């Protein structure tokens with residue numbers, strides 16, 4: 001039935017600024033929080049302010065040198081770190097900004113705190129919209145991500161769970177998470193993403209894991225314009241088969257909103273209902289679940305998406321008419337929660353979707 005939901009948020013998160021022209025806007029997390037507060041969704045959730053994760057907590061995955069660099073670099077001293085900036089991939093996508101380290105600490109803190117709460121069996125679901133930064137690597141920043149809060153949260157879950165399932169619905173391949181666990185069977189990573197002349201360039205159908213991890217990495221490559229009907233028809237069957245064969249005891253779901261119609265960087269055509277159907281599907285399995293953020297670059301739609309997904313987690317129905325809020329004008333000209341898909345062509349034919357699903361089903365038959 002209805003579950004207990006713990007939500008992690010720091011009121012300072014919206015003030016971190018990647019810089020002029022950078023599409024990643026932490027302010028979208030504050031818009032989400034304010035919208036969900038004005039819908040009354042605070043009355044049913046336990047709200048927590050995450051601790052600032054320590055460099056030590058971060059080094060459970062990342063190298064000591066990379067975390068020391070992140071904790072030391074600032075816009076005023078960048079000139080003295082040109083060598084380490086190249087080595088750790090700090091540049092246009094992952095710039096140095098005021099409070100970069102604290103932003104990483106808050107993003108990571110929410111994910112790890114949520115994982116601890118799930119481990120202690122004190123909540124059914126934990127939500128951290130500031131997390132889900134799936135591209136960060138052991139000693140390298142990538143694609144707007146510096147510290148891989150997801151990998152850290154999964155390592156925390158692995159203390160009490162033999163098998164953890166990771167599902168990623170961001171439009172970009174979940175490469176950092178896939179790479180971290182590529183050679184183990186204790187985590188199964190499942191990513192649905194645009195593949196072909198698109199960042200990060202990984203996530204081929206044929207990337208299925210290695211060694212003990214062979215068959216424990218699943219990739220569903222898609223083309224432009226996927227819609228609710230098409231996504232829905234493959235998501236539930238794949239996740240159901242993964243649940244059946246893998247039998248995970250905890251799940252982490254990355255809810256990157258750049259898979260929505262009208263995203264500034266994305267090329268998919270999902271509505272908020274289509275995206276949220278993934279949360280409904282996963283929630284139905286009644287397993288401890290950590291829901292995380294990720295991409296999303298048309299910020300009014302990211303706030304709508306994550307507000308609706310928080311309502312889905314709470315089994316609370318909320319009206320389509322948006323309540324008045326601090327950012328009301330951002331939701332014009334309609335001031336509604338739900339969005340309409342565009343007229344873009346769906347290049348994922350029904351036959352292509354079935355064929356890729358059948359290839360993934362063949363790989364899933366190889367599990368013990």
Ligand SMILES: CCC(O)(O)CCCCC[C@H](NC(=O)C1CN(C)C1)c1[nH]c(-c2ccccc2)nc1C(N)=O
Pocket residue numbers: 021022023092093132133134135143144145170172199256258265294295296
């Ligand atoms: C938070 C999780 C997430 O998966 O959503 C993150 C998505 C990251 C997208 C990164 C992308 N970067 C690249 O394509 C760079 C150029 N190539 C040599 C690598 C990129 N960087 C930028 C960019 C634009 C302006 C200023 C800075 C970066 N745009 C793009 C783009 N359109 O793909």
Ligand SMILES: [Ca+2]
Pocket residue numbers: 168169170171172173174191192193
């Ligand atoms: Ca993905």
Ligand SMILES: [Ca+2]
Pocket residue numbers: 181182183184185186187188189209213216217
């Ligand atoms: Ca794996």
Ligand SMILES: [Zn+2]
Pocket residue numbers: 170171172256258294295296
């Ligand atoms: Zn993305």
